[PDB]
Amino acid sequence: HMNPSTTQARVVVDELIRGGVRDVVLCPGSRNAPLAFALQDADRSGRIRLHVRIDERTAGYLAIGLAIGAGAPVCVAMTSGTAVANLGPAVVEANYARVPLIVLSANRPYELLGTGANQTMEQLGYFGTQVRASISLGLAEAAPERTSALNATWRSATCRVLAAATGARTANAGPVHFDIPLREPLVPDPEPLGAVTPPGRPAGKPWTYTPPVTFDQPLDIDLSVDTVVISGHGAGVHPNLAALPTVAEPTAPRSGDNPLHPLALPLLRPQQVIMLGRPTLHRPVSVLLADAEVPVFALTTGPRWPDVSGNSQATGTRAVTTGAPRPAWLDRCAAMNRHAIAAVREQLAAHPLTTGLHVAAAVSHALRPGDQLVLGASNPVRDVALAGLDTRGIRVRSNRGVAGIDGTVSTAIGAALAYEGAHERTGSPDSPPRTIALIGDLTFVHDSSGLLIGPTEPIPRSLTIVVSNDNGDVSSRIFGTPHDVDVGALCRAYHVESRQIEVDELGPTLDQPGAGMRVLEVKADRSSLRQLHAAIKAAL
Amino acid sequence: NPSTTQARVVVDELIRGGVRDVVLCPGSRNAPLAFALQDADRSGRIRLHVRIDERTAGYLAIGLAIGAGAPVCVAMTSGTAVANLGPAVVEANYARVPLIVLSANRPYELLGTMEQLGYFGTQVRASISLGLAEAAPERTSALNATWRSATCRVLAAATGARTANAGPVHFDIPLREPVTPPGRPAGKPWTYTPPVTFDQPLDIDLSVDTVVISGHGAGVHPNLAALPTVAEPTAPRSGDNPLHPLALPLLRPQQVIMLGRPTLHRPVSVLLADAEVPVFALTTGPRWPDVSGNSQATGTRAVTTGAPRPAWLDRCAAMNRHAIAAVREQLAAHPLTTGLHVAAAVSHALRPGDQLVLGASNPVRDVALAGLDTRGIRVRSNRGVAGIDGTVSTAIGAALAYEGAHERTGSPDSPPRTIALIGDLTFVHDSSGLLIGPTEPIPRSLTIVVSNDNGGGIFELLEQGDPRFSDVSSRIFGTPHDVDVGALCRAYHVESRQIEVDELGPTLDQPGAGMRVLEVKADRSSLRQLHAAIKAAL
Amino acid sequence: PSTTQARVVVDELIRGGVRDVVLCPGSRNPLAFALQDADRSGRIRLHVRIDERTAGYLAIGLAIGAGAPVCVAMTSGTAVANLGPAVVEANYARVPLIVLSANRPYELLGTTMEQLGYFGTQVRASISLGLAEAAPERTSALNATWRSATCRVLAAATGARTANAGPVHFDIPLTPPGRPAGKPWTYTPPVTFDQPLDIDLSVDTVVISGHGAGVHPNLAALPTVAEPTAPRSGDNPLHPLALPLLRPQQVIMLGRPTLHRPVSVLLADAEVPVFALTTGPRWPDVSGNSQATGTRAVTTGAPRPAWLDRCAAMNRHAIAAVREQLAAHPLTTGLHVAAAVSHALRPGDQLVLGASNPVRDVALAGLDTRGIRVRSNRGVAGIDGTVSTAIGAALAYEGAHERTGSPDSPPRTIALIGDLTFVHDSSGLLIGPTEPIPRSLTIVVSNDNGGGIFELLEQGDPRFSDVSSRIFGTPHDVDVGALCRAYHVESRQIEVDELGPTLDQPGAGMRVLEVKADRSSLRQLHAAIKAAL
Ligand SMILES: Cc1ncc(C[n+]2csc(CCOP(=O)(O)OP(=O)(O)O)c2C)c(N)n1
Ligand SMILES: Cc1ncc(C[n+]2csc(CCOP(=O)(O)OP(=O)(O)O)c2C)c(N)n1
Ligand SMILES: O=C(O)c1cc(O)c2ccccc2c1O
Ligand SMILES: O=C(O)c1cc(O)c2ccccc2c1O
Ligand SMILES: [Cl-]
Ligand SMILES: [Cl-]
Ligand SMILES: [Cl-]
Ligand SMILES: [Cl-]
Ligand SMILES: [Mg+2]
């Protein structure tokens, strides 16, 4: 009846859907045709949304966007060869950002490794320690009597792939390499003489159910000691710490309503630091975490705990708090937070030229509750932190794992599609929410291929990309001249609407109703930034 | 600083070892041998190429190595460099390309930049770490010897000087966070390793009806020059008796001599798997291919007795004329331009001495179906893993190294031409390879011909191209993109022109800017029927 | 500079719970001197061996004896290869093993550190300290960097944050105080790993508990087939031979089962839901039949009286069939020796079981694990290193009893192993005069002169009788008594009826009791028990 490659591909796709996979990114190939056929039919029946891309490296960052936008595991299926190697960059990012990314690689049978067979390499284990698991399905046997047993083993392995990627039993979500060797026949047989897919558990249940896991590690912390909370990427929400002064990275969730501008920390003298997540962005933050006199308590949601400090007195998951912060200490930190905010506000106005900070400040004001903000992990994240954005009621995403230039555009597109997707299922007939991306010009040009979306492929409903164009070791001689790439020409090539506006119009133009996907380019300056940052520092 | 001394010794020995080009990317950490390479660039001892995209940088290095046969260095500088260099390193492994990867590790920092993947173990020929530099005026003669000896190991491993198996090498130079000692006289390398002769004679009787199938990495065998030879475009031709690939299924060879690693044509793979046909594998290195475990014997050269029967050579020649006529006649009888028409136009426009860079998918297959005469012509293609990524940067590096070899011959004639034939998906995959800063070296005679059928044409010719999949194959296989290629080249400031297949000939004869892209629109909705008409007219 | 780094690291390892360290004489290795100072000062115990393989398995025993992390110090360019087996066992049995290495960063590399592939697949973490400097202006900062990293090593080995103990590779490439009151530099409270599973005990349920299983009070009433190394939670045991006689409709699987074919068949039956309750993040599956994973059970309902009565009946029939067929058998088999050891055990004893038949035979003899501590290398079920495992297990066990100030002599550690197992790791008996030696260790060897377990497998079928003596039985004809005397260890040959009384007498700290056994009748015995059911 049904050939083994088709049966295996349909069973795997079926178990992945039951595991919560709503979006799959597919790259074209011949060896992965079984997976391609099963995925396309699951897209026809509405069980998943399929995204086709041509460039596997940007496809991996699209899949990362599809996962951080709503929280679901996301699969990316590709053929054998360098197609798997091109997933390298996205796997590394997903490792340090803890993104549940499933690399579903088709492969030749392993017996062909070493024979010179076309388009065949050492795929299994290619990703080394960067993945949470390298799992290989077997080669499918042509034995309809073993069909019952193979369905159980295939579905149980797919569940193991899903459990490791989502961190269902480790609290350490990350990328997983799921390698599937496939042999001919690679296409489905004539459907008149066809079969039905071996069934899973009744009522759409996963083959192996993993109920919610709890990882608890309580820590004693006395709050009467003058305490500042520094929250970075992957930080959890802690209600018992919402009163304390908090220096929060843009991608960190806010526990309370007592902010502290990063520029204010070096001008204060905390006696005790509570570190939430993986702080990385601010240098004065990094300075304070080096100082050995100030005790540091680390609180993480997963088992990995950051090494950005040397005087880590203790690491846990939550705090059992004793006491309450001194009101004089609270008055001091709030006083200095207002002083830092005003210093940034005055020097921005006192500056003649539009810099990247002005663009970042303009986007911050235009934000509204419910919006999603995607930030290039270079300057845009630091700039929005200097402009003191209030991340309450907005979801802020950024590839803070390795903070690479790769794939920023694709991540924005993916996060938008995932966000607007979860808005449909909540039943609201209201319009889809907004996703605004702020990225530099060198990052936009570098991942301009990420703008490519085939005519038949899903397109974000309300994504606006704001490109702050500052036109910019012997390896730094390429930065000595402007790359001179017309942002509008790239957008025309990839059939994307573009507009070159000014920072004054940034607000009103961002409020124009949803026009699908669009790119807004703001011209900015880089020559005067050294004076602006020196002006702000002197104003403090 | 004893480290800047180390860096100057290594760069000198690498130049003595034949390295004429190095590729750099800006990174968070300082580049390995960053400043020493810069002095070597201004001195004219070496040519530096800088790129932003580390993936396109790896493939540019491959192009710089295969265009002239020299070893090439790429200097990793960031924490994403290992991941992005993966594709090029894998291709360098399977295509046997001398690729040196320079990295600088920090021994005073806690471990537990570089992001370690698992491929370095399986792909590289050697992993050599220099060692930390320490000041010692009484050991300058000794540290000069250790550094240059290890540098000679790195080059010998990468070029296959002692193994006959070129490939990528990982060279690590540890650094401590912040004149040149001499080498051998006359510019000679520190440790002279004479290239080795790797010899495996094999007895083959040529009176048995024999066909030769030469693939990637095949050698030149003068004693086999008379036999009917089905040769891939990248294989150097050794005779004047070509056998069209479509004529192979109309014959019954009793013996097959397989040169190098064949990767094209399903009739070839069916023949090589036939257990009733002895297959003899002749390779230039230690690796050897088998299709279905049907390689009877391995070697490097044939010790031949006998000669092909004149009746056998006549049958092969008759079947060859039928195949050539069928392709020419059916192409003329087809209204729409396909990628196969473009391949025949590019093939008829080449001249002796030109370089041809062929992308994967149909272009490299279509050129073979067009009967391209590869003699006097240098043909390149990344057949190691047959990826469609990095083919634009590979052509650019191939043009740059090929032109530099013509400059060093001192001929006043214009630089030789490099013509690249790639699909549209291939072009879209690595369009970023066109972004070259005005400071960097740019080719002077590179023409990229893009055969644009708005998607993946080869899938029309495979099993998923069957009409019973017509309703499902468009999205997941054809994958149209609707990209404006001229607008892309415009954005990157590359001369671009859309032309018809009839104007393709004369357009390549006229020179132009040192780099330009010629886009020919094509159709893939008639591809499967054009190929069926060719098979039936055989 | 390196002497200070080595002495800082040793202090944090002692503050982290390390009480024993194994090392081997090697071509080099500072850490040796620092470890030496702590040994004379009494802060750790040092154990030296010549055989690096046996050194790795000694450290495993030192870990599972009391539950502490243990360090082993490689010193040559053969230690990685020789420590391989012990690292693999530590990985699969979740044993806190710290492997200490020393790289040379000022030397040409790649043209005492032999790299194999197992480190990247077996260890929980790989942490290299980094080269030391000389500026005493940052000695306070270097102190924190070393003690923090050492705390990372200990946390990965003991599973402090991941609940998955295992081996760790620590590279120290070639006195600033710690936190006051001897606490570790970075405190990490042990983590609680929780997954509640809804299970209806009203369905006819059996509990199968294997290696690494936890203790479950709300499952104490259910019939329980428990492997020897499993800790028992209730008092309704179900003899393993009774399982094929019953027809359960639901299975709760604790830990990682590895024994008894009937169990493997039951766990694979697609008509029976299996629930895997584990103590860590890994979970086992036989044929993809595990339908849910968890760490504890939220139980509704109660077991039917009809189901419990049926289970108690077949249990009784099985214990009686084994106790009776063992009496009718004239020759002494390894199954008689397992029953003799089990009935000679008192509460508070430690029992070390080798693989092959000894671990299975003790289960067939129905030993009551309550009050006693069973140890076995069930991670990969190998016959190597079992002797050194029992020596280290004895040492750490008596060490925990010495530190409680009890006046009574050390508690008993009895090891039941086979002959092939004894020969495989006979070198582990070679212990120098200055090295620590157990004071209450008895190694009972059931010597049937070959592999008895093979007579019970398909190769033991009589149609292979003429072709299976060489390649499965493997007779050795080794004089165990002469071997023990050569290594200066007490040895005595006794009969099964003499095993109990001799075990009750305390003798030299290490004694090897060898009982002659037969395997030619093993397949016939087991066929007799099956027919008696
Ligand atoms: C990196 C990579 N990803 C995917 C593939 C699978 N693949 C093989 S041929 C092909 C289509 C290429 O299309 P195009 O370059 O337009 O060529 P055409 O066959 O249409 O001439 C694809 C995606 C590959 N070979 N390499
Ligand atoms: C290192 C290792 N090699 C081989 C095996 C395979 N094996 C399993 S049981 C066994 C026989 C051991 O015989 P013995 O220790 O005398 O025990 P018996 O079954 O006779 O009681 C062997 C070789 C193993 N488990 N470990
Ligand atoms: O001859 C060659 O060039 C060549 C190159 C390769 O990368 C091979 C890989 C596997 C098996 C055979 C191979 C081979 O024969
Ligand atoms: O529970 C345990 O102790 C345990 C231990 C292991 O080493 C495992 C290995 C693979 C699969 C499951 C495992 C498991 O459940
Ligand atoms: Cl950016
Ligand atoms: Cl014929
Ligand atoms: Cl190809
Ligand atoms: Cl066993
Ligand atoms: Mg195409």
Ligand SMILES: [Mg+2]
């Ligand atoms: Mg035995």
